[PDB]
Amino acid sequence: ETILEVNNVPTNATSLMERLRFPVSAQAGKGELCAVFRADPGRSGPWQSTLLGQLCGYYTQWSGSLEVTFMFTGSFMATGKMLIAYTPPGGPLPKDR
Amino acid sequence: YSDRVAQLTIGNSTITTQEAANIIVGYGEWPSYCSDSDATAVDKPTRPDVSVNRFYTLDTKLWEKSSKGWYWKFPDVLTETGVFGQNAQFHYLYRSGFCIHVQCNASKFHQGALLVAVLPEYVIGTVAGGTGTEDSHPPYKQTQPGADGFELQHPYVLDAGIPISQLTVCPHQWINLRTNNCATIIVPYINALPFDSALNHCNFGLLVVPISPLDYDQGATPVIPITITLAPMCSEFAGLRQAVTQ
Amino acid sequence: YSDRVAQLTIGNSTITTQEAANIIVGYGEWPSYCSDSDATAVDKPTRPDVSVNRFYTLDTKLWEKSSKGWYWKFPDVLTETGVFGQNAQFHYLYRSGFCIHVQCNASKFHQGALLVAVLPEYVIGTVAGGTGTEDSHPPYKQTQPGADGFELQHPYVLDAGIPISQLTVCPHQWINLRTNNCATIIVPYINALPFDSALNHCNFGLLVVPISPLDYDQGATPVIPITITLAPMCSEFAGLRQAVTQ
Amino acid sequence: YSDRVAQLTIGNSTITTQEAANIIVGYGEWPSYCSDSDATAVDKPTRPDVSVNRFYTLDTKLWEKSSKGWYWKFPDVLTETGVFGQNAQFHYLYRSGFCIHVQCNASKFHQGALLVAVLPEYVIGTVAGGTGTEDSHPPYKQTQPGADGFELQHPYVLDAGIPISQLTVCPHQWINLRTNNCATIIVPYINALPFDSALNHCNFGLLVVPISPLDYDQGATPVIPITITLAPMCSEFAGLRQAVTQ
Amino acid sequence: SIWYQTNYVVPIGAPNTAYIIALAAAQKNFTMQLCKDASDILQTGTIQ
Amino acid sequence: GDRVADVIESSIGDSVSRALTHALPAPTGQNTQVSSHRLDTGKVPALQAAEIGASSNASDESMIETRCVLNSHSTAETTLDSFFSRAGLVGEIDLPLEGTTNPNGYANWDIDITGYAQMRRKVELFTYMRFDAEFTFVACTPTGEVVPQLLQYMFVPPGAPKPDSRESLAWQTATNPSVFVKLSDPPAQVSVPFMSPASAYQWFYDGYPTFGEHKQEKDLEYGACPNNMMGTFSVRTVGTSKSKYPLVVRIYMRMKHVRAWIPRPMRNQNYLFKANPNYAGNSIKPTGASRTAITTL
Amino acid sequence: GDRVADVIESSIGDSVSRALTHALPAPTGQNTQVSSHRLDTGKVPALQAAEIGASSNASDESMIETRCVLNSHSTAETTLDSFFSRAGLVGEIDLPLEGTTNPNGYANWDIDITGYAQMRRKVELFTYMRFDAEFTFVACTPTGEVVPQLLQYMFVPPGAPKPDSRESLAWQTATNPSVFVKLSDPPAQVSVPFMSPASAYQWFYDGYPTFGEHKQEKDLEYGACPNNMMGTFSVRTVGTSKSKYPLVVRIYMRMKHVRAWIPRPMRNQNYLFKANPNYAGNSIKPTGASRTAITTL
Amino acid sequence: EIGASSNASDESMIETRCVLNSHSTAETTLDSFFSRAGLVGEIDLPLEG
Ligand SMILES: CCCCCCCCCCCCC/C=C/[C@H](O)[C@H](N)CO
Ligand SMILES: CCCCCCCCCCCCC/C=C/[C@H](O)[C@H](N)CO
Interchain CB distance below 8 Å, B35 and G4? yes
CB B73 within 8 A of CB B143: yes
Interchain CB distance below 8 Å, H23 and E33? yes
Residues from chain H that touch G194, judged by Cβ atoms under 8 A, are none
The domain containing residue F252 runs over which residues?
1-297
* Beta-carbon contacts of residue D139 (< 8 Å; ≥ 6 apart): none
Q: Is the Cβ of B73 closer than 8 Å to some Cβ of chain C?
A: no
Closest CA to C171 of C203, C124, C197: C203
List Cα–Cα distances, D54 to C39, C129, C157, D81, D84, in angstroms. 57, 87, 88, 12, 9
Residue of B nearest to H15 (CA): B11
Interchain CB distance below 8 Å, C239 and A89? yes
Residues from chain C that touch F4, judged by Cβ atoms under 8 A, are 33-36
Dihedral over Cα of F204, F206, F211, F217: its sign: positive
Residue nearest to atom 2 of ligand 1 (CA): F155
Which of B34, B104, B123 should be substituted to probe chain F, the one whose Cβ sees the most F Cβ atoms within 10 Å? B123
Cα–Cα distance measured from residue B146 to residue B80, given in angstroms and rounded to the nearest whole number: 9
Angle between helices B82-90 and C82-90 (to 10 degrees): 180
Residue G115 alpha carbon, nearest atom of ligand 2: 17
Residue G113 alpha carbon, nearest atom of ligand 2: 17
Residue of H nearest to E21 (CA): H1
The residues of H whose Cβ lies within 8 A of any Cβ of B are: 12-15
Residues from chain C that touch A65, judged by Cβ atoms under 8 A, are 42
Half-sphere exposure (CA, 13 Å, Cβ side) for B5? 2
- Which ligand minimizes its atom distance to the CA of F277? 1
CB C231 within 8 A of CB C53: yes
Residues from chain F that touch H16, judged by Cβ atoms under 8 A, are 6
Interchain CB distance below 8 Å, C204 and G206? yes
Residues from chain G that touch A58, judged by Cβ atoms under 8 A, are 175
Smallest Cβ distance to A91: which of C40, C200, C241?
C241
- The DSSP H or E segment spanning C83 is helix C82-90
SS3 labels along chain F: CCCCHHHHCCCCCCCCCCECCCCCCCCECCCECCCCCCCCCCCCCCCCCHHHCCCCCCCHHHCCCCCCECCCCECHHHCHHHHHCCCEEEEEEEECCCCCCCCCCCEEEECCCCCCHHHHHHHCCECEEEEEEEEEEEEECCCCCCCCCEEEEEEECCCCCCCCCCCCHHHHCCCCCEEEEECCCCCEEEEECCCCCCCCEECCCCECCCCCCCCCCCCCCCCCCHHHCCCEEEECCCCCCCCCCCEEEEEEEEEEEEEECCECCCCCCCCCECCECCECCCCCCCCCCCCCCCCCC
Residue nearest to atom 9 of ligand 2 (CA): G230
- C149 CA to chain H: closest CA distance, Å? 37
CB G84 within 8 A of CB G125: no
Give the resolution value in Å. 3.3
CATH of the domain at B145: 2.60.120.20
Half-sphere exposure (CA, 13 Å, Cβ side) for F117? 10
Half-sphere exposure (CA, 13 Å, Cβ side) for F61? 10
Residues from chain E that touch B8, judged by Cβ atoms under 8 A, are none
Cα C107 to ligand 1 centre (Å): 61
List Cα–Cα distances, F124 to D73, F76, F113, F262, F268, in angstroms. 80, 21, 11, 11, 11
Interchain CB distance below 8 Å, A60 and G231? yes
Which of G7, G11, G16 should be substituted to probe chain F, the one whose Cβ sees the most F Cβ atoms within 10 Å? G7
CATH of the domain at G113: 2.60.120.20
* Cis peptide bond upstream of A12, omega within 30: yes
Q: Which residues pair with D115 in a beta bridge?
A: D174, D209
Closest CA to D62 of D231, D221, D220: D221
Would the CB of G177 count as within 6 Å of ligand 2?
yes
Cα–Cα distance measured from residue C200 to residue C187, given in angstroms and rounded to the nearest whole number: 20
In chain D, what are the helix, strand and coil shares in percent, each to the nearest 5? 10, 35, 55
Q: Is the Cβ of B51 closer than 8 Å to some Cβ of chain C?
A: yes
Smallest Cβ distance to F278: which of B125, B201, B204?
B125
Give phi and psi for H31, each to the nearest 5.
Answer: -75, -45
Per-residue DSSP letters for G136-167?
EEEEE-TT------EEEEEEE-TTSPPP-STT
- G19 CA to chain C: closest CA distance, Å? 5
Alpha helices in G53-116 (DSSP H): 80-84
Q: Is the Cβ of A22 closer than 8 Å to some Cβ of chain D?
A: no
Closest CA to C24 of C47, C8, C9: C8
Which is it for strands D6-10 and D13-17: parallel, antiparallel or unpaired?
antiparallel
Quote the distance between the C-alpha of residue D127 and its chain's center: 24
- Which ligand minimizes its atom distance to the CA of F115? 1
Residue nearest to atom 11 of ligand 2 (CA): G228
Smallest Cβ distance to G287: which of C165, C168, C173?
C165
- E9 CA to chain H: closest CA distance, Å? 22
List Cα–Cα distances, D120 to D124, D160, D174, D192, D233, in angstroms. 12, 13, 18, 11, 17
The domain containing residue B132 runs over which residues?
1-246
Neighbours of chain C (3+ CB pairs under 8 A): A, B, F, G, H
Interchain CB distance below 8 Å, C36 and H19? yes
- As for how many domains chain D has, the answer is 1
CB F207 within 8 A of CB B201: yes
Helix (H, G, I), strand (E, B) or coil at A55: helix
Q: Which of residues 135-154 of C touch G (CB under 8 A)?
A: 135-140, 143, 153-154
Residue nearest to atom 13 of ligand 2 (CA): G113
Residues from chain H that touch C37, judged by Cβ atoms under 8 A, are 20, 22
Per-residue DSSP letters for B147-180?
SS-EE-S-SSB-SSS-BGGG-SSSSEEEEETTT-
Greatest C-alpha distance within chain B: 63
Interchain CB distance below 8 Å, D180 and H1? yes
CB C18 within 8 A of CB B24: no
Listed by the residue before each break, gaps in chain D with C–N over 2.5 Å are none
CB atoms near residue C176 (< 10 Å) = 19
Closest CA to G50 of D40, D106, C212: C212
Q: Which amino acid is at F232?
A: T
Cα F113 to ligand 1 centre (Å): 5
Closest CA to C113 of C221, C228, C211, C226: C211
Cα–Cα distance measured from residue D234 to residue D32, given in angstroms and rounded to the nearest whole number: 6
Dihedral over Cα of G161, G162, G165, G167: its sign: positive
Residues in chain E: 48
Closest CA to A41 of A15, A77, A65: A65
CB B97 within 8 A of CB B234: yes
Cα F94 to ligand 1 centre (Å): 19
- As for how many domains chain G has, the answer is 1
Q: Which residues pair with C15 in a beta bridge?
A: C8
Q: Which residues line ligand 1 (CB under 6 A)?
A: F 111-114, 133, 135, 153, 155, 177, 190, 192, 201, 203, 228-230, 233, 275
* Cis peptide bond upstream of F254, omega within 30: no
Quote the distance between the C-alpha of residue F117 and its chain's center: 11
* Cis peptide bond upstream of A45, omega within 30: yes
